[PDB]
Design a binder for this molecule. Structure first.
Ligand code: NAG
Ligand code: NAG
Length: 223
C-alpha cells in the first residue's frame, strides 16, 4: 500500500494473507467461514500456499490471534490472463474459520449494484510502498476515490487518490476495496508506478450470483 497509514490491530478483521512457504504474496477477504475471496491473478507463478487470517504483524506468530488454512478448492469464473478479465477467485478453506474479534466476514454487495464516481472507499494490505520495494510488516490503509467510468473499464471499478501517491502496490493483489461497508472490488492491477493510478479492481457486484452459487455448492468439483 502506497501513501497510507499504519492500521491498528483488528481494524480490518476480514483481511487475509496468502502466503507461500510463509511468504506473503497476496491479500484477500473472508466472505464466508469457508471461503476467502481473492484475485485469480495471484495464482499464476498454485494452491501450495496457505491462508492466514487474523494476522497483524507479519513477523510475529500471534498464536492467540491467527488461524491458518489450507486451500481445499479454487473457483474462477472466466479468468482471462491475457486481458486480466474476470480477475476473481474463490478459495475454499480446509475448514470453517472461527469467528473472533480478530476474524470476521466482509459482506458483499447485491448483484449488479453500483458505486458512483466520487465515492470514498478504503483499501488496506501488507503490500509495499514502492514498486519492487519490500513488503510492509503491518497492514496499511489508504482513503481512495472512485473515478469516472471513462477512466476505467466495465469489468472493473477504478480509484485514485486526491493526493499524490496512493494506491496498491506489490503484495496488495486480491485485497479488497471497501465502499460503504461492502466489498465492491478485488485488487487487480494498476498501471505504472504504484501511487500513479488509477487502480483497477474487479467489480464484485457483477459476480454476486455466481458467488452465491459457489457458497451454496461447496466441494472440490469434478474428478
Ligand atoms: C444484471 O444486469 C445484466 C446486464 O445489464 C442483466 O442482463 C441481468 O438481468 C441483471 N441481473 C439482475 C439480478 O438485475
Ligand atoms: C481517511 O478519511 C477520513 C475522513 O476524511 C479522514 O478523517 C482520515 O484521516 C483518512 N485516513 C487516511 C488514512 O486517509
Amino acid at each position: 500500500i502506497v501513501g497510507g497509514r499504519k492500521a491498528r490491530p483488528r481494524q480490518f478483521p476480514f483481511l487475509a494473507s496468502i502466503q507461500n512457504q510463509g511468504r506473503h504474496f497476496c491479500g484477500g477477504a473472508l466472505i464466508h467461514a469457508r471461503f476467502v475471496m481473492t484475485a485469480a491473478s495471484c495464482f499464476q507463478s498454485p494452491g501450495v500456499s496457505t491462508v492466514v487470517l487474523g494476522a497483524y504483524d507479519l513477523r510475529r506468530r500471534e498464536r492467540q490471534s491467527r488461524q491458518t488454512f489450507s486451500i481445499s478448492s479454487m473457483s474462477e469464473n472466466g479468468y482471462d490472463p491475457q486481458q486480466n478479465l474476470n480477475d476473481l477467485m474463490l478459495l475454499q478453506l480446509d475448514r470453517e474459520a472461527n469467528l473472533t474479534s480478530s476474524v470476521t466476514i466482509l459482506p458483499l454487495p447485491l448483484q449488479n449494484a453500483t458505486v458512483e464516481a466520487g465515492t470514498r472507499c478504503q483499501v488496506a494490505g501488507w503490500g509495499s510502498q514502492r514498486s519492487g520495494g519490500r513488503l510492509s510488516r503491518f497492514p496499511r490503509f489508504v482513503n481512495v476515490t472512485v473515478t469516472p467510468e471513462d477512466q476505467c473499464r466495465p469489468n472493473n471499478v477504478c480509484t485514485g487518490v486526491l493526493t499524490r501517491r496512493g494506491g496498491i502496490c506489490n503484495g496488495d493483489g486480491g485485497t479488497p476495496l471497501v465502499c460503504e461497508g461492502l466489498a465492491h472490488g478485488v485488487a487487480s492491477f494498476s498501471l505504472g508506478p504504484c501511487g500513479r493510478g488509477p487502480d483497477f479492481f474487479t467489480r464484485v457486484a457483477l459476480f454476486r450470483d455466481w458467488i452465491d452459487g459457489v457458497l451454496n455448492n461447496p466441494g472440490p468439483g469434478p474428478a
